Amino acid sequence: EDDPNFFKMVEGFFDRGASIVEDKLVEDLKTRETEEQKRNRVRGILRIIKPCNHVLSLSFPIRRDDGSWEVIEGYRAQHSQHRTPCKGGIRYSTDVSVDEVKALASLMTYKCAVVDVPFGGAKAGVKINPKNYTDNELEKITRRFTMELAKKGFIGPGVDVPAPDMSTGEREMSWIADTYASTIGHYDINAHACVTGKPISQGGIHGRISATGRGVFHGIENFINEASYMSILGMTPGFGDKTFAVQGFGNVGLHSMRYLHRFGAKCVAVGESDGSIWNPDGIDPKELEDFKLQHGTILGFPKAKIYEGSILEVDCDILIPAASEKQLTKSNAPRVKAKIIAEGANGPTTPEADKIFLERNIMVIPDLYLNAGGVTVSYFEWLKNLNHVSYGRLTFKYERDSNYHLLMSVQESLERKFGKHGGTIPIVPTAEFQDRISGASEKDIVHSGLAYTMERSARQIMRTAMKYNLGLDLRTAAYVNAIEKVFRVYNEAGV
Amino acid sequence: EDDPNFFKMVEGFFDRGASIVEDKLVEDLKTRETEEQKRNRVRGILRIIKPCNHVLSLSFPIRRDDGSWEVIEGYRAQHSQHRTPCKGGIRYSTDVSVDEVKALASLMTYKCAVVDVPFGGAKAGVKINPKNYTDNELEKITRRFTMELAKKGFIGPGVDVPAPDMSTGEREMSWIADTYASTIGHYDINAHACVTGKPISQGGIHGRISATGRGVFHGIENFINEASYMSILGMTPGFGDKTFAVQGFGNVGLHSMRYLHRFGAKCVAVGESDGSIWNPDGIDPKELEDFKLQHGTILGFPKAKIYEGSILEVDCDILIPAASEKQLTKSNAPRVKAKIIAEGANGPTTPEADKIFLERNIMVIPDLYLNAGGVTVSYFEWLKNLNHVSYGRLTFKYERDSNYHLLMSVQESLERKFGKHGGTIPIVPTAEFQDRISGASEKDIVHSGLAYTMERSARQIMRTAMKYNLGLDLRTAAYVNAIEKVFRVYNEAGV
Amino acid sequence: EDDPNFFKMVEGFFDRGASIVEDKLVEDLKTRETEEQKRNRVRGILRIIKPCNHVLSLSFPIRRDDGSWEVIEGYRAQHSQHRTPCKGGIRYSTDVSVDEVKALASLMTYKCAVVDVPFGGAKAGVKINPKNYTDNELEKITRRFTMELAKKGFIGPGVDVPAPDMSTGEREMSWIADTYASTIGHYDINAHACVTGKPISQGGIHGRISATGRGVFHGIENFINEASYMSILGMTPGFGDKTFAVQGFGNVGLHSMRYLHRFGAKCVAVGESDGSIWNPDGIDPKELEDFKLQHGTILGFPKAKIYEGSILEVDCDILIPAASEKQLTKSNAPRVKAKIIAEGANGPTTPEADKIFLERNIMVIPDLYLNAGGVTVSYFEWLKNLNHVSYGRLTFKYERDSNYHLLMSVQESLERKFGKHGGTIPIVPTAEFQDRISGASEKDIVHSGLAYTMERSARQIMRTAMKYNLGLDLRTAAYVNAIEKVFRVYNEAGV
Ligand SMILES: NC(=O)C1=CN([C@@H]2O[C@H](COP(=O)(O)OP(=O)(O)OC[C@H]3O[C@@H](n4cnc5c(N)ncnc54)[C@H](OP(=O)(O)O)[C@@H]3O)[C@@H](O)[C@H]2O)C=CC1
Ligand SMILES: NC(=O)C1=CN([C@@H]2O[C@H](COP(=O)(O)OP(=O)(O)OC[C@H]3O[C@@H](n4cnc5c(N)ncnc54)[C@H](OP(=O)(O)O)[C@@H]3O)[C@@H](O)[C@H]2O)C=CC1
Ligand SMILES: NC(=O)C1=CN([C@@H]2O[C@H](COP(=O)(O)OP(=O)(O)OC[C@H]3O[C@@H](n4cnc5c(N)ncnc54)[C@H](OP(=O)(O)O)[C@@H]3O)[C@@H](O)[C@H]2O)C=CC1
Ligand SMILES: Nc1nc2c(ncn2[C@@H]2O[C@H](COP(=O)(O)OP(=O)(O)OP(=O)(O)O)[C@@H](O)[C@H]2O)c(=O)[nH]1
Ligand SMILES: Nc1nc2c(ncn2[C@@H]2O[C@H](COP(=O)(O)OP(=O)(O)OP(=O)(O)O)[C@@H](O)[C@H]2O)c(=O)[nH]1
Ligand SMILES: Nc1nc2c(ncn2[C@@H]2O[C@H](COP(=O)(O)OP(=O)(O)OP(=O)(O)O)[C@@H](O)[C@H]2O)c(=O)[nH]1
Ligand SMILES: Oc1c(Cl)cc(Cl)c(Cl)c1Cc1c(O)c(Cl)cc(Cl)c1Cl
Ligand SMILES: Oc1c(Cl)cc(Cl)c(Cl)c1Cc1c(O)c(Cl)cc(Cl)c1Cl
Ligand SMILES: Oc1c(Cl)cc(Cl)c(Cl)c1Cc1c(O)c(Cl)cc(Cl)c1Cl
């Protein structure tokens, strides 16, 4: 009950936001036939943006360990190409259908527009349940899948760059890169930039794994510290006195929990497919993770009870959906308790849940902004691959020396003016500037680059929510920017 | 009522035929684990054949003559690649969906297996009604469509070679070739072999337009002259005393009517979308065509009345469906009158109509054989393009001389043995051998090559219908061969 | 008269400068056969530099809006490739001939040598009068032109990178990039680096439009502030008391006027093809531009009279030719009034006008230096495209933090030495260092990079004019450096 066509579901958000700005897009336009044919031409460009450009559907055979033949299905969709290459991960699930992949792909592009990553949207899906395949079988699958994508122009450094999503980690990325760089890209100087989310030894970048969590953190942080928004929710600014619950203890889930906890937030609930756990006094990220690693499940965790009932309904301040889509529907929407909904996963709530949450006066930080930390960091990995140099190497020593001389320049100058009367005036770095004395390292850029991006995009949305009184409809605010940016292109290039 | 999903409908025919042969495919197999794991491996290979390998879905913009923006959808599916390149036409219709294109694509491959054309199956569709677009708009569409196909490996001399289908003629093929050879294939020595059904001046081959009609003729001819099959129908062999009716006065329809009429068959009905016409005394192909060209419709034709009622039900000997799919369904099936059903179009009858026709004892010459004359000739065009010489050029003079000497060798020899007593014994060619004195021409090869193929494939099917007592279930007989052939490749190819 | 072959005209400047340095190029040379065969080998290398390497001549058809067929001609020349790729704009005019394109191409390479941009010279021309073609027809032309260039290796990220010139702006560049990245470069990770001067939304860079004007400004600034040169002209250093007149109110014209005016210079005349305008009290850049945009011409401008007579002869301090070539010839040369000639356009003055201006003691700042600001900025755009990151993104936050700590390091140190006695010694940034606290942004690098380059190259020329007493023959000084740099390269290469 309340199950909408994910693709159209996203189109819904797009159209809603399209209207809001349609007027501006016509005013800025300065063409000759100034008459409202301008208004049609804008609507024409919009009708062009909405649909995917290329969608590849695969069906290929693999040989099961038991010697039998099985046909596996997979898809890869390229939504837009107003920016090259396309970006978007690969989800391994039995729920993948073209409609889903087409939707996630489109979310990737608007996602990038919000966060200013120069990539068009894309997304992949292989209809399998990894839990029923041996490691050996999976590898054969992801490798062969890379090939059939390659052969048709659906993966490449300047075409389409995959990344992780559901049930795919750096292990999968690692095989993808290897297959590509060993075959199609044997001569490509940018071969390893054909995919992101790779192991660091494979050319991955620091913190891409925890990237999304760290991003989710910044997303919330930017909003839970506004008052303008916190008042409307009857909430005190700051994390120190908040309790949250998260659906999905995975890449985006685990790390989301990790960072919030790090800033005095309390995890009162954690969920999965098998069940949810709870504890009003709070659950710890590190022991839960080790229990989960050792036992392969969160159910049974000693310092917490096996909560019976919807993880999406538990009593808390912030609800973090980090599982699959449409978890928050029209049904359960009214029974959420939480004041803040930080959309960790892509499209975890239906259009109607939004509607209800708006009325219920519960703030929903949209997915296409809140979870954009993943690509922001993937983009940094991609730049790293192109550069072929790890940040800081060429300059670590030069800056260090240069910095000590800068500091020595004020010292010797002051000793000159205040003579022997002041004796020596030692100018040493503080503990903080000491940690920076050489300049930024790879770790430093990811951390601050992400932060700069999450913060900067937050303001861009807030600023918009104001200019159009969307109040707590941040999702619409977010799409306005995406459209506003993606449009400025298609317009300025003869479509 | 009864209009199943097209793709599975064809899968239906495949499975049915799969069973019939499954046994043979296991007997011929000579592997080590001779136990019936052999039977699973065969079923495994079959599960692999059935689905399409690659399906590209396009969505791109074109600029309407009135200056507006419209998004047009198109698809191209590559069913199999056990043979390279893929082959199959492009249909321009508003009824094209992936399911349809996926179906037609699969029919192309089995079609080729029956007729022995070394191509894997493929098919394209662009969701538009050509009748609502100017010539200028169409060209923009077909050209841009060729590009988006090219960019993703869905058109190329050794990859996928398109051809005509519904609402696409040599005009469209001509633009396709031009776009390709002018861009992607500028350096390809086989650039113009990227598509068939081209204008002869564009590298087309003689008779490709009337190819399918001529083929349909041969298909019927091979069966309407067996007695073995004609007896079971209570019909005298030969065309001389037969009356037929055809649904669709198009490329496959018009020419089908043309050739049958040429051999003393009488066209009593012709149909279209607007309506059907009739005349028990027979309608003439040439005057109907000129009326149709001059007036843009068959309705109103002077030497015939405007028949009210289903063209598929009119009283005649042979019913030729040359329109779209599923015309003959479970409903109207029982009211057909005709004894012979020559499937001109692809899949014009549902699985149940078959069933009824079997019982009703009405012979149905399957589409995947009867209309294979098109690709057989397309294949000849493709070979012509690769050869870069039209049949006969290099040898016309040599054979002519060589032949006159061969004939002169018996002459001078006989004059030698019978001396002056017999005087001169002139050895001149007959009128027939004179027409061949130089050897086969492009026209000659198409005509006899087609004939050789239609006939040879007919026997292959008949021969099969006997070995498995399918009697009048020729469709199943046809699929048995297709499967039987497509199989061997995969078996010993490394699957 | 005085209408020489634009190509030889430039060759003239080259030979003249060739001689001046020939001696040095032989002295530095340290080969075995030290005898003056060295002097032949240098002359041999020079005979090799002078001519273009590849010149493509195009002739292709376009379809006029009124349905008719017209053949359009175009050329693209690649002068040198001692540096890859080639660089140089596209001029849309009816005056384009191979000789012109070959000339402008050669000016591009020496232009780059003076300014240190690692590109060999190139240039294009399409023989049409844009003023007689609709926007729709132009686009068809520029797109099809990009294709015919592509097909033959005359456009590509690492081959030949076009840019704007006469009657071509970012609109044309935008279509060029689009056609390339959508076809030939669909897989190129550097596809959008196939051309510069693109809209910013298309990957353009900040200030490339006003780049040349800004450059022209710096060019003059570096010379109008030397005294060494200002004395010889009987002129006070500085812009504050100068009046200039410019021929051509276009990309290079308008912005040239803009920047000079910004620094207290007074525009007393502005010209075009239809006519010139004047005002001894000065004309304003902003109102003239708006009049020109609204009315499509400068003639009629309220705050100025319609000057009857040559714009190249008006009374002023500095004459800025920003129109086509050979405007200042032997004829009108003696009647110029201005003391300074800032060659904005490429080769606006004939070899003899030079001669006269030398005698007349009028300083001519050579085109191949003065207007090099365009490529310098185009080069920055190209680097931007390769980098796939806009300057500053990765480091904005890190530097800002790092800087506050640097400043905090002196603060905490001083508070330590001067204890409570000095209380807090707050170390805050000035307004200027505040504007830089995060580091350079894209805007910052273009502006200072251009300045660094214009200034540095000015000194290189002055320094040379001295070592060879060319006094006011800066053109010859400029070519000496170009040759001196390019030669070295063909030298050490294996030729
Ligand atoms: N790098 C990334 O992976 C990124 C992902 N995202 C977003 O987050 C989501 C991806 O999470 P990833 O795929 O990152 O998570 P990972 O697969 O690790 O998440 C694993 C967890 O998800 C739980 N889970 C799955 N389905 C449900 C469900 N219906 N209800 C409750 N729990 C469930 C699993 O339980 P079980 O194991 O029993 O299924 C498991 O504990 C995507 O939708 C995407 O939009 C965004 C940016 C980065
Ligand atoms: N080279 C080829 O074209 C080949 C074609 N074929 C087969 O023939 C069919 C292709 O026909 P082409 O595409 O050759 O035909 P063309 O478009 O000429 O066929 C035109 C005729 O089809 C009629 N028609 C369309 N829809 C219907 C309908 N729903 N009911 C009755 N009549 C209808 C049209 O009426 P109207 O004009 O008013 O729309 C017109 O008279 C395919 O299905 C294919 O399997 C097989 C091999 C080769
Ligand atoms: N990136 C760049 O664009 C660079 C440009 N340059 C130089 O500047 C020149 C380019 O100018 P752009 O092409 O920038 O100028 P744009 O075409 O805008 O210049 C337009 C102006 O040129 C005037 N004009 C053209 N021909 C004549 C003529 N015969 N007599 C008088 N006025 C004339 C036009 O008048 P009207 O409109 O009535 O024809 C118009 O006002 C080039 O030759 C180039 O070497 C230098 C460096 C880089
Ligand atoms: N998968 C996973 N890795 C973790 C986790 N916590 C820490 N890591 C580690 O991240 C490590 C390197 O971290 P760098 O300092 O050394 O980590 P960091 O940037 O300070 O981590 P954050 O403070 O969360 O941003 C790796 O060696 C991982 O073991 C976790 O909860 N899950
Ligand atoms: N539409 C149509 N085309 C025809 C017909 N007859 C011949 N053609 C043409 O086939 C032409 C050249 O044909 P020929 O070499 O004379 O044909 P043919 O071998 O005698 O034709 P069949 O007799 O093989 O059809 C092409 O230009 C077609 O237009 C016809 O009755 N209808
Ligand atoms: N390119 C251009 N821009 C103009 C002109 N006149 C006004 N503008 C304004 O340029 C504005 C943005 O200017 P900026 O990019 O910040 O200018 P800038 O690079 O600091 O300008 P300069 O310091 O002269 O190079 C827009 O909002 C326009 O309204 C003109 O003649 N040419
Ligand atoms: O140039 C390539 C490469 Cl190296 C890989 C792929 Cl998948 C594609 Cl498609 C191309 C471009 C290309 C080709 O290289 C060839 Cl020989 C044929 C085609 Cl129809 C196309 Cl479009
Ligand atoms: O060359 C390519 C590349 Cl490298 C990518 C793509 Cl997608 C396409 Cl379509 C082409 C085909 C192509 C072209 O698009 C053009 Cl204009 C010229 C050539 Cl001689 C070639 Cl071979
Ligand atoms: O790719 C070719 C081919 Cl097949 C032939 C030639 Cl004579 C050349 Cl020199 C190339 C190099 C080349 C290319 O590799 C691409 Cl992609 C485009 C272009 Cl216009 C060109 Cl000239």
Task: Please list the alpha-helical segments (H only) found in B373-473.
Answer: 373-387, 396-417, 431-434, 442-467
Q: Is A494 on the interface with B (CB under 8 A)?
A: no
User: Using a CB-CB distance cutoff of 8 angstroms, which residues of chain B are in contact with residue C186?
Assistant: 151
Q: Is the peptide bond before B85 cis (omega within 30 degrees of 0)?
A: yes
A25 Cα to chain B: minimum distance (Å): 17
The CB density around residue C242, as the number of other CB atoms within 10 Å, is 22
| Alpha-carbon gap, residue C146 to C163, rounded angstroms | 12
| Alpha-carbon gap, residue C277 to C305, rounded angstroms | 6
Q: A334 near A361, Cβ under 8 Å?
A: no
| Alpha-carbon gap, residue B57 to B70, rounded angstroms | 17
Q: Decide if B58 and A61 are in contact by the 8 Å CB cutoff.
A: no
C215 lines ligand 3 (CB under 6 A): no
C438 lines ligand 3 (CB under 6 A): no
3-state SS class at A319: strand
For residue B432, the number of C-alpha atoms closer than 13 Å in the C-beta half-sphere is: 0
B48 Cα to chain A: minimum distance (Å): 6
| Residue where the block lists tokens 């100034």 | A34
- Give the A window 91-130 contacts with B, CB below 8 Å: 98
A274 lines ligand 1 (CB under 6 A): yes
| Alpha-carbon gap, residue A65 to A68, rounded angstroms | 7
Q: C317 near C243, Cβ under 8 Å?
A: yes
Residue type for position A268:
V
| Alpha-carbon gap, residue C123 to A265, rounded angstroms | 63
Q: Which residue of chain A is at minimal alpha-carbon distance from B98?
A: A57
Which class for B180: exposed (0-12), middle (13-18), buried (19 or more C-beta within 10 A)? buried
Instruction: For residue B344, report the distance from its CA to the centre of ligand 5, in Å.
Output: 20
Q: C213 near C236, Cβ under 8 Å?
A: no
| Alpha-carbon gap, residue A165 to C345, rounded angstroms | 55
| Alpha-carbon gap, residue C36 to C55, rounded angstroms | 34
Contacting residues for C281 by C-beta, under 8 A, at least 6 apart: C266
3-state SS class at C237: coil
- Give the B window 202-261 contacts with A, CB below 8 Å: none
Q: For residue C277, what are the β-bridge partners?
A: C270
| Alpha-carbon gap, residue A48 to B61, rounded angstroms | 7
Instruction: For residue A158, report the distance from its CA to the centre of ligand 7, in Å.
Output: 14
Torsion angle of the four alpha carbons B351, B357, B358, B360, in this order, in degrees rounded to the nearest 10: 150
Q: Which residue of chain B is at minimal alpha-carbon distance from C183?
A: B151
Distances in whole angstroms, Cα of residue C32 to Cα of each of A49, C488, C491, C495: 67, 17, 15, 18
| Alpha-carbon gap, residue B403 to A388, rounded angstroms | 72
3-state SS class at C291: helix
Q: Is C286 on the interface with B (CB under 8 A)?
A: no
What is the 3-state composition of chain C as percent helix, strand, coil, each rounded to the nearest 5?
45, 15, 40
Which two tokens mark C190? 């550097």
Q: A232 near A361, Cβ under 8 Å?
A: yes
**What would the CATH number be for the domain defined by C203-495?**
3.40.50.720
B487 Cα to chain A: minimum distance (Å): 15
3-state SS class at B89: coil
Distances in whole angstroms, Cα of residue B255 to Cα of each of A221, B297, B380: 74, 17, 19
Which two tokens mark C486? 């390019």
Q: How was this entry determined?
A: X-ray
| Alpha-carbon gap, residue C495 to C45, rounded angstroms | 8
User: Using a CB-CB distance cutoff of 8 angstroms, which residues of chain C are in contact with residue A222?
Assistant: none
| Alpha-carbon gap, residue C491 to C495, rounded angstroms | 7
Nearest to B58 by CA among B108, B96, B105, B95: B96
Q: Which helix (H) or strand (E) holds B55?
A: strand B54-63
| Alpha-carbon gap, residue B320 to B229, rounded angstroms | 18
Q: B350 near B329, Cβ under 8 Å?
A: yes
| Alpha-carbon gap, residue B347 to B92, rounded angstroms | 17
Q: Which helix (H) or strand (E) holds A281?
A: strand A276-283
Q: Which helix (H) or strand (E) holds C115?
A: helix C98-115
Would you list the DSSP string of C41-105?
HHHHHHHHHSS-SEEEEEEEEEE-TTS-EEEEEEEEEE---SSSSEE--EEE-TT--HHHHHHHH
Pairing of strands A69-78, A90-92: unpaired
| Alpha-carbon gap, residue C110 to C326, rounded angstroms | 19
Which two tokens mark B487? 């199989």
Q: Is A85 on the interface with C (CB under 8 A)?
A: yes
To test the contact with chain A by mutation, choose from B48, B69, B123 the residue with the greatest count of A C-beta atoms within 10 A, namely B69
| Residue where the block lists tokens 């060494």 | C228
For residue B405, the number of C-alpha atoms closer than 13 Å in the C-beta half-sphere is: 6
| Alpha-carbon gap, residue C352 to C358, rounded angstroms | 10
| Alpha-carbon gap, residue A160 to A203, rounded angstroms | 18
Which class for A108: exposed (0-12), middle (13-18), buried (19 or more C-beta within 10 A)? buried
Which two tokens mark A360? 């219920």
For residue C223, the number of C-alpha atoms closer than 13 Å in the C-beta half-sphere is: 31
Torsion angle of the four alpha carbons B123, B129, B134, B138, in this order, in degrees rounded to the nearest 10: -20
Select which of B123, B140, B266, B339 is catalytic: B123
Q: Which helix (H) or strand (E) holds A266?
A: strand A266-271
Residue type for position B372:
A
Closest ligand to C-alpha of residue C370 is: 3
Closest ligand 5 atom to residue B213 Cα is: 25
Q: Is C147 on the interface with B (CB under 8 A)?
A: yes
Nearest to C124 by CA among C80, C161, C170: C161
Q: Is A482 on the interface with B (CB under 8 A)?
A: no
| Alpha-carbon gap, residue B175 to B142, rounded angstroms | 7
Which class for B46: exposed (0-12), middle (13-18), buried (19 or more C-beta within 10 A)? buried
Q: Decide if C389 and A383 are in contact by the 8 Å CB cutoff.
A: yes
First to last CA, chain A: 40
Which class for B439: exposed (0-12), middle (13-18), buried (19 or more C-beta within 10 A)? middle
Backbone angles phi, psi at C208, to 5 degrees: -75, -25
CATH class of A54-202: alpha beta
Residue type for position B2:
D
Residues in chain A: 495
Instruction: For residue B106, report the distance from its CA to the centre of ligand 1, in Å.
Output: 37
3-state SS class at A52: coil
Distances in whole angstroms, Cα of residue C447 to Cα of each of A279, C218, C440, C443: 59, 11, 10, 6
Contacting residues for C66 by C-beta, under 8 A, at least 6 apart: none
Distances in whole angstroms, Cα of residue A296 to Cα of each of A131, A137, A209, A292: 12, 20, 20, 5
Instruction: For residue B385, report the distance from its CA to the centre of ligand 4, in Å.
Output: 62
Q: B77 near B123, Cβ under 8 Å?
A: yes
| β-sheet with A243-247: strand ranges across | A276-283, A266-271, A243-247, A318-321, A340-342, A363-365
Q: How many pairs of residues across B and C have Cβ atoms under 8 Å apart?
A: 7
Residue type for position B160:
D
Structural domain spans, chain C: 1-53, 54-202, 203-495
B61 Cα to chain A: minimum distance (Å): 7
CA-nearest residue, atom 18 of ligand 3: C250
C305 Cα to chain A: minimum distance (Å): 29
Q: Which helix (H) or strand (E) holds C120?
A: strand C120-126
| Alpha-carbon gap, residue C237 to B43, rounded angstroms | 93
Pairing of strands C69-78, C86-87: unpaired
Contacting residues for A206 by C-beta, under 8 A, at least 6 apart: A200, A442, A443, A446
Would you list the DSSP string of B94-159?
TT--HHHHHHHHHHHHHHHHHHT---EEEEEEE---GGGS-HHHHHHHHHHHHHHHHTTTSSBTTT
First to last CA, chain B: 40
Q: Decide if B71 and A58 are in contact by the 8 Å CB cutoff.
A: no
| Alpha-carbon gap, residue C8 to B406, rounded angstroms | 72
Give me the sign of the Cα torsion angle B115, B119, B120, B121: negative
| Alpha-carbon gap, residue A107 to B67, rounded angstroms | 30
Pairing of strands C120-126, C69-78: antiparallel
Q: B275 near B254, Cβ under 8 Å?
A: no
For B57, the closest of A37, A55, A63 (CB atoms) is A55
B129 Cα to chain C: minimum distance (Å): 24
Q: Is A41 on the interface with B (CB under 8 A)?
A: yes
Closest ligand 1 atom to residue A252 Cα is: 14
Contacting residues for A238 by C-beta, under 8 A, at least 6 apart: A224, A225
| Alpha-carbon gap, residue B285 to B261, rounded angstroms | 8
| Alpha-carbon gap, residue B335 to B317, rounded angstroms | 13
Which two tokens mark B318? 């042979």
| Residue where the block lists tokens 């190409």 | A81
Estimate to the nearest angstrom the gap between the alpha carbon of B164 and the chain centroid. 11
Q: Decide if A489 and C175 are in contact by the 8 Å CB cutoff.
A: no
Pairing of strands B120-126, B69-78: antiparallel
Would you list the DSSP string of B183-200?
TTTSS-TTGGGS-SS--G
| Alpha-carbon gap, residue B386 to B157, rounded angstroms | 9
3-state SS class at C155: coil
For residue C62, the number of C-alpha atoms closer than 13 Å in the C-beta half-sphere is: 24
C184 lines ligand 8 (CB under 6 A): yes
- Give the A window 313-372 contacts with C, CB below 8 Å: none
Nearest to A269 by CA among A246, A292, A253, A286: A246
Instruction: For residue B153, report the distance from its CA to the centre of ligand 7, in Å.
Output: 7
Closest ligand to C-alpha of residue C54 is: 9
User: Using a CB-CB distance cutoff of 8 angstroms, which residues of chain A are in contact with residue C412?
Assistant: 430
Would you list the DSSP string of B270-330?
EE-SS-EEEEEEEE-HHHHHHHHHHHSSSTT-TTSB---S-TTTSS-SEEEE-SSS--B-T
Torsion angle of the four alpha carbons A471, A342, A353, A121, in this order, in degrees rounded to the nearest 10: 90
User: Using a CB-CB distance cutoff of 8 angstroms, which residues of chain B are in contact with residue A71?
Assistant: 47-48, 51
A108 lines ligand 1 (CB under 6 A): no
| Alpha-carbon gap, residue C81 to C99, rounded angstroms | 19
Active-site positions of C? 123
| Alpha-carbon gap, residue A154 to A194, rounded angstroms | 10
For A54, the closest of B44, B52, B56 (CB atoms) is B56
Q: DSSP state, C145?
A: H
Which two tokens mark C172? 């044309």
| Alpha-carbon gap, residue A83 to A210, rounded angstroms | 26
**What would the CATH number be for the domain defined by A1-53?**
1.10.287.140
Domains B54-202 and B203-495 share a fold: yes
| Alpha-carbon gap, residue C111 to C118, rounded angstroms | 11
Backbone angles phi, psi at C299, to 5 degrees: -65, 125
| Alpha-carbon gap, residue A288 to A305, rounded angstroms | 12
Q: Decide if B55 and A57 are in contact by the 8 Å CB cutoff.
A: yes
Task: Please list the alpha-helical segments (H only) found in C183-307.
Answer: 211-223, 228-232, 251-262, 285-295
Residue type for position A99:
D
- Give the C window 170-189 contacts with A, CB below 8 Å: 174-175, 177-178, 181, 186-189
- A partners (3+ CB pairs within 8 A) are B, C
Q: Which residue of chain A is at minimal alpha-carbon distance from C405?
A: A433
| Alpha-carbon gap, residue A116 to C392, rounded angstroms | 13
Q: Is C401 on the interface with A (CB under 8 A)?
A: yes
Q: B42 near B25, Cβ under 8 Å?
A: yes
Angle between helix B170-182 and helix B135-150 axes, rounded to 10 deg: 50
Which residues in A322-466 belong to E strands, given as ranges? 340-342, 363-365
Closest ligand to C-alpha of residue C56 is: 9
Q: C210 near C199, Cβ under 8 Å?
A: no
Q: For residue B278, what are the β-bridge partners?
A: B269, B305
Distances in whole angstroms, Cα of residue A364 to Cα of each of A476, C49, C445: 11, 66, 40
Which class for B293: exposed (0-12), middle (13-18), buried (19 or more C-beta within 10 A)? exposed
Pairing of strands C86-87, C120-126: parallel
| Alpha-carbon gap, residue C247 to C349, rounded angstroms | 13
Torsion angle of the four alpha carbons B59, B63, B68, B69, in this order, in degrees rounded to the nearest 10: 20
Backbone angles phi, psi at B108, to 5 degrees: -60, -40
Residue type for position B387:
N
Instruction: For residue B275, report the distance from its CA to the centre of ligand 2, in Å.
Output: 14
| Alpha-carbon gap, residue A471 to A232, rounded angstroms | 9
Nearest to B486 by CA among B207, B68, B143, B106: B106
Closest ligand 8 atom to residue B151 Cα is: 7
- B partners (3+ CB pairs within 8 A) are A, C
Distances in whole angstroms, Cα of residue C410 to Cα of each of A407, C89, C426, C430: 8, 51, 9, 15
